[PDB]
Amino acid sequence: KISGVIGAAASSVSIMVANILRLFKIPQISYASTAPELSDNTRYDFFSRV
C-alpha cells in the first residue's frame, strides 16, 4: 500500500499523475515541477512541491 509519492520532474507528468492521486487520496511531493496551475487547491489538492 502506497502512502506517498515523490513526484515527477516535468509539469505535464505531474499534472497527469496528480489527477489520479487525487481520486485515490495519496499525497504527492515534487522536486522539479513549477507550473503555476498546480497551486490551485480546488483542482490539485494533494500536490506539494519543494
- Positions touching another protein (CB under 8 A) are 19-20, 22-23, 43
Give the count of residues interacting with ligand HVG (CB under 6 A): 7
Greatest CA span in the chain, whole angstroms?
A: 30
Q: Is 19 helix (H, G, I), strand (E, B) or coil?
A: helix
The reply on whether position 49 binds ligand HVG by CB under 6 A is: no
Return the beta strands (E) in 1-50 as ranges. Answer: 5-6, 28-30, 47-49
Which positions from 13 to 32 touch ligand HVG by CB under 6 A, shown as an x/- string? -------------------x
Q: Are 30 and 14 in contact (CB under 8 A)?
A: yes
For ligand HVG, the closer CB: 13 or 26: 13
